[PDB]
Structure formats: C-alpha cells, structure tokens
Write a protein that binds this ligand. Sequence first.
Ligand code: LRP
Length: 181
Amino acid sequence: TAHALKDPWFLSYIPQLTPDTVKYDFDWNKAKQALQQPLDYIRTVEEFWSTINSLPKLHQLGNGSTFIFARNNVDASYEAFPNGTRVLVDLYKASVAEKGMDFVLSSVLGEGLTYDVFNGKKVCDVVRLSSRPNQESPELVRLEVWLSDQLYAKDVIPYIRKGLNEAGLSFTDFIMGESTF
Ligand SMILES: CO[C@@H]1[C@H](O)[C@@H](COP(=O)(O)OP(=O)(O)OP(=O)(O)OC[C@H]2O[C@@H](n3c[n+](C)c4c(=O)[nH]c(N)nc43)[C@H](O)[C@@H]2O)O[C@H]1n1cnc2c(N(C)C)ncnc21
C-alpha cells in the first residue's frame, strides 16, 4: 500500500521545556516523564508528510516548546549519546523555518544524510525542533540534528548549510552551530 521508512520515528512534544522550568522539576528523567506528550509514530513516507504538514508552527507555541522525532522510539537523552554531538540550526523567520524543517527532516527521516554523508551509518537518531525567541528575533526556531559520533559534525554542518541554500534560504536566514554532549 504505503512506503515504509528505513525505520519508524516516534514523534513527541515537550511543552515550554526551559532550563528554569526543570527548577519546578528540582533531575531530567522526571521532568520528561511528566511533561512529554506522545503525538504519533511515523512508519511510512505518506505518514511522514501528513504529520509534517499537520505540525502546529513552532513560534506560535510557547518558548521552549520542543518536537522530538526519535528513531525506533529511542530516548532523546544526552546520556544515550556519549561520543555524540548536536548540530544546531537557528532560523530567524517562521516562513523560512518551514522550508528548513522540511529539508532537515527529509534528510534525516528519508535517510538522506545516511547515504550522502555517513556512507550507510545511521549516525542520526534524534531531530528536535523548538521555539527559542529573543527580544531581537521572536519568530526564531531551533533545529537540532543529534549525532551518535562527533567525528561526523564536521561533515553534517557543510551538508545542512548547502541543503538550506538550495532550499531557498540565504546566509542571514539561518545560523549553523554545535553543542558537544
Ligand atoms: C552553541 O550551543 C549553545 C549551548 O551549548 C546550548 C545549551 O542548550 P540549552 O541550555 O538551550 O538547553 P537545551 O538545548 O537542552 O534546551 P531545552 O531542551 O529546550 O530545555 C533545557 C532544559 O532541559 C534539560 N534537558 C533537555 N534535554 C533534551 C535533556 C537531556 O537529554 N538530558 C538531560 N539531562 N537534561 C535535558 C536541560 O538540563 C535543561 O534544564 O545552546 C546553545 N545556545 C547558544 N545560544 C543560545 C541561546 N540564546 C542566545 C538565546 N538560547 C539557547 N541555546 C543557545
């Protein structure tokens, strides 16, 4: 009937997930346990597209509101990925952030990164998408591409930036970054 992804990805939502909100939650395990909401289990390309299209625009939700796409329903914990890293993308307008999200998700879930960068290795298991507004940029959206190995971030950063340029985004439309685990 429909076309299976290489792996199903579980989609969850953590509302207004901020560092000073885990102040209300003293521990990470219990903050997630209580706040995370399950949204869907993407098995196919058809399921993928309807989910991506149905997603309520990140900036509209509260500051810190994250969407987690976790390969084979893995726990998106830094703890789970010790030799890893997370490639960051900040998108200044909500308009560009749609095009950007569509690229980064199609590259991850569609195994684009896997066969274009990792030579077959499934290095990416988590993609987080959250609202991170500034007094400066209030429509700001952040994408995190989680890696199992930091050796690859050196190659994920030019690949994602090149893809985003091809997707229509200028250099003022986004900023690439990294955060070690
Ligand atoms: C370049 O890299 C910079 C830093 O290295 C990295 C630190 O991440 P956070 O503290 O945001 O944290 P995180 O990305 O996890 O945010 P979020 O998940 O939404 O909520 C944070 C809270 O959630 C907790 N948390 C969240 N997660 C996902 C976990 C997890 O897996 N394990 C554990 N133990 N805790 C987790 C965390 O401890 C904290 O209390 O963020 C980059 N950064 C740079 N500028 C900014 C900026 N500006 C200018 C406004 N705002 C935000 N991040 C910025």
